[PDB]
Design a protein around this motif. Structure first.
Motif, PDB file in Angstrom:
ATOM      1  N   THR A  44      -6.308 -16.098  -5.918  1.00 23.65           N
ATOM      2  CA  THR A  44      -7.591 -15.939  -7.681  1.00 23.65           C
ATOM      3  C   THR A  44      -7.343 -14.537  -7.909  1.00 23.65           C
ATOM      4  O   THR A  44      -7.227 -13.685  -8.592  1.00 23.65           O
ATOM      5  CB  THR A  44      -8.367 -16.734  -7.598  1.00 23.65           C
ATOM      6  OG1 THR A  44      -7.793 -18.007  -7.448  1.00 23.65           O
ATOM      7  CG2 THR A  44      -8.270 -16.349  -9.072  1.00 23.65           C
ATOM      8  N   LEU A  45      -8.220 -13.668  -7.282  1.00 24.11           N
ATOM      9  CA  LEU A  45      -8.735 -12.462  -7.227  1.00 24.11           C
ATOM     10  C   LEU A  45      -7.536 -11.244  -7.227  1.00 24.11           C
ATOM     11  O   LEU A  45      -7.541 -10.691  -7.861  1.00 24.11           O
ATOM     12  CB  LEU A  45      -9.637 -11.816  -5.846  1.00 24.11           C
ATOM     13  CG  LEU A  45     -10.420 -10.366  -5.682  1.00 24.11           C
ATOM     14  CD1 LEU A  45     -11.338  -9.941  -5.197  1.00 24.11           C
ATOM     15  CD2 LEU A  45      -8.811  -9.643  -5.381  1.00 24.11           C
ATOM     16  N   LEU A  46      -6.681 -12.028  -6.014  1.00 21.73           N
ATOM     17  CA  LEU A  46      -5.089 -10.939  -6.184  1.00 21.73           C
ATOM     18  C   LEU A  46      -4.353 -10.574  -7.588  1.00 21.73           C
ATOM     19  O   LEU A  46      -3.728 -10.156  -7.891  1.00 21.73           O
ATOM     20  CB  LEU A  46      -4.354 -11.095  -5.594  1.00 21.73           C
ATOM     21  CG  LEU A  46      -4.016 -10.742  -4.160  1.00 21.73           C
ATOM     22  CD1 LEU A  46      -3.738 -11.060  -2.687  1.00 21.73           C
ATOM     23  CD2 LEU A  46      -5.245  -9.075  -3.965  1.00 21.73           C
ATOM     24  N   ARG A  47      -4.241 -12.524  -8.211  1.00 20.85           N
ATOM     25  CA  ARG A  47      -4.096 -12.387  -9.412  1.00 20.85           C
ATOM     26  C   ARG A  47      -4.651 -11.459 -10.584  1.00 20.85           C
ATOM     27  O   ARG A  47      -4.053 -11.080 -11.356  1.00 20.85           O
ATOM     28  CB  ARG A  47      -3.626 -14.373  -9.461  1.00 20.85           C
ATOM     29  CG  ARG A  47      -2.318 -14.500  -8.491  1.00 20.85           C
ATOM     30  CD  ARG A  47      -2.441 -16.080  -8.764  1.00 20.85           C
ATOM     31  NE  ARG A  47      -1.083 -17.030  -8.265  1.00 20.85           N
ATOM     32  CZ  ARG A  47      -0.940 -17.589  -7.882  1.00 20.85           C
ATOM     33  NH1 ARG A  47      -2.013 -18.553  -7.590  1.00 20.85           N
ATOM     34  NH2 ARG A  47      -0.254 -18.195  -7.182  1.00 20.85           N
ATOM     35  N   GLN A  48      -5.766 -11.379 -10.981  1.00 22.04           N
ATOM     36  CA  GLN A  48      -6.473 -10.911 -11.233  1.00 22.04           C
ATOM     37  C   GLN A  48      -6.490  -9.857 -11.616  1.00 22.04           C
ATOM     38  O   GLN A  48      -6.018  -8.534 -12.655  1.00 22.04           O
ATOM     39  CB  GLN A  48      -8.231 -11.467 -11.149  1.00 22.04           C
ATOM     40  CG  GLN A  48      -8.763 -12.792 -11.387  1.00 22.04           C
ATOM     41  CD  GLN A  48     -10.141 -12.946 -11.005  1.00 22.04           C
ATOM     42  OE1 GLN A  48     -10.791 -13.972 -11.263  1.00 22.04           O
ATOM     43  NE2 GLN A  48     -10.246 -11.333 -11.677  1.00 22.04           N
ATOM     44  N   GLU A  49      -6.639  -8.840 -10.068  1.00 17.53           N
ATOM     45  CA  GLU A  49      -6.541  -7.630 -10.356  1.00 17.53           C
ATOM     46  C   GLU A  49      -4.727  -7.024 -10.415  1.00 17.53           C
ATOM     47  O   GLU A  49      -4.317  -6.217 -10.966  1.00 17.53           O
ATOM     48  CB  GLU A  49      -6.119  -7.210  -8.755  1.00 17.53           C
ATOM     49  CG  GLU A  49      -7.841  -7.050  -8.480  1.00 17.53           C
ATOM     50  CD  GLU A  49      -8.700  -5.868  -9.228  1.00 17.53           C
ATOM     51  OE1 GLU A  49      -7.683  -5.230  -9.751  1.00 17.53           O
ATOM     52  OE2 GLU A  49      -9.610  -6.638  -9.534  1.00 17.53           O
ATOM     53  N   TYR A  50      -3.761  -8.089 -10.769  1.00 14.23           N
ATOM     54  CA  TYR A  50      -2.586  -8.274 -11.022  1.00 14.23           C
ATOM     55  C   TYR A  50      -2.367  -8.548 -13.080  1.00 14.23           C
ATOM     56  O   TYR A  50      -1.712  -7.405 -13.193  1.00 14.23           O
ATOM     57  CB  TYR A  50      -1.896  -9.137 -10.296  1.00 14.23           C
ATOM     58  CG  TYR A  50       0.062  -9.378 -10.629  1.00 14.23           C
ATOM     59  CD1 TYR A  50       0.923  -8.177  -9.469  1.00 14.23           C
ATOM     60  CD2 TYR A  50       0.346  -9.388 -11.992  1.00 14.23           C
ATOM     61  CE1 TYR A  50       1.590  -7.304  -9.586  1.00 14.23           C
ATOM     62  CE2 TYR A  50       1.349  -8.716 -12.649  1.00 14.23           C
ATOM     63  CZ  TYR A  50       2.878  -8.060 -11.288  1.00 14.23           C
ATOM     64  OH  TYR A  50       3.726  -7.995 -11.480  1.00 14.23           O
ATOM     65  N   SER A  51      -2.866  -8.661 -13.234  1.00 15.08           N
ATOM     66  CA  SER A  51      -2.908  -8.453 -14.790  1.00 15.08           C
ATOM     67  C   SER A  51      -3.948  -7.491 -15.204  1.00 15.08           C
ATOM     68  O   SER A  51      -3.437  -6.990 -15.944  1.00 15.08           O
ATOM     69  CB  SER A  51      -4.174 -10.246 -15.460  1.00 15.08           C
ATOM     70  OG  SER A  51      -3.339 -11.009 -14.781  1.00 15.08           O
ATOM     71  N   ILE A  52      -5.102  -6.442 -14.437  1.00 12.55           N
ATOM     72  CA  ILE A  52      -5.990  -6.066 -14.752  1.00 12.55           C
ATOM     73  C   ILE A  52      -4.716  -4.753 -14.950  1.00 12.55           C
ATOM     74  O   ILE A  52      -5.299  -3.759 -15.381  1.00 12.55           O
ATOM     75  CB  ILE A  52      -6.899  -5.959 -13.442  1.00 12.55           C
ATOM     76  CG1 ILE A  52      -8.122  -6.870 -13.800  1.00 12.55           C
ATOM     77  CG2 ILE A  52      -7.654  -4.251 -14.139  1.00 12.55           C
ATOM     78  CD1 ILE A  52      -9.020  -6.672 -12.895  1.00 12.55           C
ATOM     79  N   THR A  53      -3.998  -3.717 -14.017  1.00 13.55           N
ATOM     80  CA  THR A  53      -3.073  -3.070 -13.642  1.00 13.55           C
ATOM     81  C   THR A  53      -1.802  -2.868 -14.445  1.00 13.55           C
ATOM     82  O   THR A  53      -1.248  -1.845 -14.757  1.00 13.55           O
ATOM     83  CB  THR A  53      -1.948  -3.666 -12.859  1.00 13.55           C
ATOM     84  OG1 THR A  53      -1.145  -4.513 -13.411  1.00 13.55           O
ATOM     85  CG2 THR A  53      -2.552  -4.020 -11.883  1.00 13.55           C
TER      86      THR A  53
END
Length: 345
Positions: A44-53
């Motif tokens: 979930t955290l990596l997925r969030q970071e992915y959207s943030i990019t």
């Protein structure tokens, strides 16, 4: 899976090559996952970071991070649960995704994108808990240094103004507090990590006695002060060396004294045309072959370093690795290609 785990011996090998990695923008991923931490949480955290990019104005950089993030997600979806010592991942660009379990259990989750890999936590358990802190003190000048094995370095140098004795006493007092604070900021974390085993306080004259008797030095450092204060004439790298050579009662300093003593013995033979030394690969080889070498001195920048180590294991020679930071190191490397032996005959 427990199969991901690597020893401290392999961790360090890897560390030498992880430390090599660099990039122009902050696009190299570092990720540490404690055993307590469910991979679905990390996912979930990596997925969030992915959207943030998308917030990364800049094509190449934006892409770079997405790619590394996806690689890490790929890696995690290969597993069911974190190993018992946790997981660590480094990914980026020449593209790779390092993944393993460390010899030591990690406890603090960490995620980062930087111009390099964050190896922080890993270096601390690949690292011998044999560090010695050194404080050289004068009324108006100080040096803070650090010794690990044969590596000696200056961490900080400090100066104060100090031209009745009342004002001057107060001035020295202020300087000692600065030195005390500076030393404590540098050395106490090391002592807390268990890496720091001792502190040498040195200097000329009486100032070091005053410094130690006052409140200047954090109590965590006071606890592991070497019993004896060391008389030393100089500051900087030179004074640090002198304090270490003279602190004969501190055990963690023997490896450094050995390297220094070996270099001096080698030079004494040179200076006295004694013939009790050998250099040149062919000569060193043949000397080793007949067990004629008592100590092999090898500059650490030699690519064949370990080969000579093996050859010195058997041949019955003691190996002294000469660090690049050793005073004569550059001379040794220049004039002897960083390879020489002291002979037993």
């Amino acid at each position: 899976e427990e199969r991901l785990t690597i020893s401290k011996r392999e961790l360090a090998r890897l560390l030498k090559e992880l430390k090599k990695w660099s990039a122009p923008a902050t696009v190299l991923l570092s990720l540490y996952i404690p055993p307590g931490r469910p991979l679905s949480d990390v996912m979930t955290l990596l997925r969030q970071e992915y959207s943030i990019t998308d917030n990364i104005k800049l094509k190449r950089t934006r892409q770079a991070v997405k790619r590394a993030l996806s690689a890490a997600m790929d890696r995690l979806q290969m597993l069911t649960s974190t190993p018992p010592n946790g997981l660590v991942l480094f990914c980026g660009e020449k593209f790779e995704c390092f993944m393993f379990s460390p010899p030591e259990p990690i406890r603090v989750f960490y995620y980062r994108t930087d111009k390099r890999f964050i190896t922080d936590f890993l270096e601390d358990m690949v690292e011998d808990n044999n560090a010695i802190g050194i404080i050289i003190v004068e009324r108006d000048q100080a040096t803070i240094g650090l010794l690990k094995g044969a590596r000696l370095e200056v961490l900080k140098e400090l100066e104060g103004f100090v031209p009745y004795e009342r004002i001057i006493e107060q001035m020295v007092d202020e300087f000692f507090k600065k030195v005390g604070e500076e030393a404590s900021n540098l050395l106490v974390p090391l002592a807390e990590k268990g890496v720091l085993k001792g502190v040498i306080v040195a200097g000329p004259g009486l100032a070091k006695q005053e410094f130690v008797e006052g409140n200047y030095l954090d109590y965590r450092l006071k606890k592991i002060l070497a019993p004896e204060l060391v008389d030393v004439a100089y500051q900087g790298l030179q004074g640090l060396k002198e304090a270490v050579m003279k602190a004969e009662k501190v055990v963690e300093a023997q490896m450094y004294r050995d390297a220094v003593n070996a270099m001096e013995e080698f030079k004494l033979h040179l200076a006295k045309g004694t013939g009790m030394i050998v250099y040149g690969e062919k000569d060193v080889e043949a000397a080793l072959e007949m067990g004629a070498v008592k100590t092999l001195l090898i500059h650490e920048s030699r690519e064949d370093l370990e080969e000579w180590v093996e050859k010195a294991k058997s041949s019955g020679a003691q190996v002294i690795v000469v660090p690049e930071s050793l005073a004569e190191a550059e001379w040794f490397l220049k004039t002897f290609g960083g390879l020489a032996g002291i002979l037993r005959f």
